[PDB]
Design a protein around this ligand. Structure first.
Ligand SMILES: CC(=O)N[C@H]1[C@@H](OP(=O)(O)OP(=O)(O)OC[C@H]2O[C@@H](n3ccc(=O)[nH]c3=O)[C@H](O)[C@@H]2O)O[C@H](CO)[C@H](O)[C@@H]1O
Length: 370
């Protein structure tokens, strides 16, 4: 009944793990939100027991990740947890090591996307990937189970003998609050009298930001459309667009926003031309708002979007194909509405957060009394 949720980012706790945490708290358990300080820490601390720690998120230096994990082991140990849920690579791997060194009896992992080491294909990345996979063989062996949010990632890690099938649990998507993301109770933001082509994402090049901005140039306001980008960029980072780029194209740049339902309600369709995903949550949110999706035909996107059902898939790394699919939907409003309607039906049937949270707790109940 002391259950911790470890992430490298408070955003994953706040956006993704939250419904599991709330359901456990409503049951009377002590729930811990373990993540570096961020923009959601203060309010998380009101709902849950917020615990921060120092983390060099992207560093691969040996001593740094060691020193980080030893400090993390002490911070975890002081919480006297019964079970720890980790998510994503650093927490899954080094978090599991730290957790077991702290004497935490039960550890559940979570893979939601394989990430950048499976996009890049250079010799340096190929080697980091082999090391990560070798470490996963150890950390998965120490852990008690792993949840996967799509099928592709589970199939892959099984095919590489990283984890035994008996420890694999497939819970498709992290869920979305379909009662908050409900068009019937949402007031659209006023973005003018345009067909808004909306992309929501941290502005990583690996999210297809460049292709989105190029597609904007290609269509150039075709049929009264307006490309709109929601999310954060960063300066002096080779992996992300900076604000100069994000403000300098044929795209209305809104930065970070906390009114996503209202933005989706104002949109014509949502685009996600990502290079790789787990089960994209902005796609789930568009679906819940009955909005068609144009996504790249890549891992994750192509499980959350079935071409011709709730959206259209486009080739990855291809601004012309992205523009072409958006133009199809601008040219055919009935098709676009029909795709979004299917998205809403599907998300309500399969991806509401409350049932997904209950399925995580059923896994926890195999190990601890809940
Ligand atoms: C693998 C990968 O590359 N990404 C995966 C990772 O999420 P990501 O870290 O890529 O997050 P995502 O882009 O799927 O979701 C971002 C979340 O932040 C919200 N938001 C974003 C910008 C903003 O200004 N305001 C705001 O509220 C947005 O509405 C959504 O709820 O894990 C997710 C949950 O399992 C999915 O599996 C993604 O595929």
């Amino acid at each position: 009944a002391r259950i911790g949720f470890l992430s490298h980012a408070d955003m994953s706790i706040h956006f993704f793990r939250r419904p599991i945490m709330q359901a456990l708290k409503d049951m009377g358990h002590e729930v811990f939100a373990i993540a570096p300080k961020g923009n959601f820490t203060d309010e998380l601390a009101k709902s849950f027991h917020a615990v921060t720690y120092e983390l060099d998120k992207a560093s691969l230096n040996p001593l740094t990740v060691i020193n980080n994990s030893k400090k993390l082991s002490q911070i975890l140990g002081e919480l006297n947890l019964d079970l720890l849920q980790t998510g994503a690579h650093k927490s899954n791997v080094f978090g599991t090591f730290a957790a077991k060194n702290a004497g935490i009896k039960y550890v559940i992992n979570l893979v939601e996307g394989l990430g950048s080491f499976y996009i890049d294909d250079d010799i340096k990345t190929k080697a980091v990937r082999f090391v990560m996979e070798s470490l996963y063989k150890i950390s998965f062996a120490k852990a008690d189970a792993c949840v996967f949010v799509n099928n592709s990632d589970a199939d892959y890690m099984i095919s590489k003998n990283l984890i035994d099938k008996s420890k694999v649990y497939r819970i498709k998507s992290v869920g979305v609050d379909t009662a908050k993301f409900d068009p019937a109770i949402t007031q659209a933001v006023d973005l003018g009298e345009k067909k808004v082509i909306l992309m929501i994402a941290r502005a990583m090049w690996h999210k297809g930001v460049r292709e989105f901005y190029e597609a904007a140039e290609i269509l150039n306001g075709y049929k009264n459309c307006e490309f709109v980008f929601v999310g954060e960029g960063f300066a002096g980072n080779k992996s992300t667009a900076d604000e100069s780029f994000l403000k300098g194209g044929k795209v209305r740049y809104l930065g970070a926003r906390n009114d996503i339902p209202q933005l989706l309600k104002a949109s014509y369709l949502l685009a996600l031309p990502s290079y790789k995903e787990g089960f994209p949550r902005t796609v789930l949110e568009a679906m819940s708002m009955a909005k068609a999706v144009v996504a790249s035909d890549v891992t994750g996107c192509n499980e959350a979007v079935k071409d011709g059902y709730n959206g259209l898939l486009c080739k990855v790394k291809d601004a012309n194909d992205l523009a072409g699919k958006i133009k199809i939907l601008l040219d055919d409003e009935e098709l676009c509405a029909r795709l979004g309607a299917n998205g809403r039906s599907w998300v309500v049937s399969e991806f509401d957060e409350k049932q997904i949270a209950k399925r995580y707790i059923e896994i926890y109940r195999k190990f601890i009394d809940v």
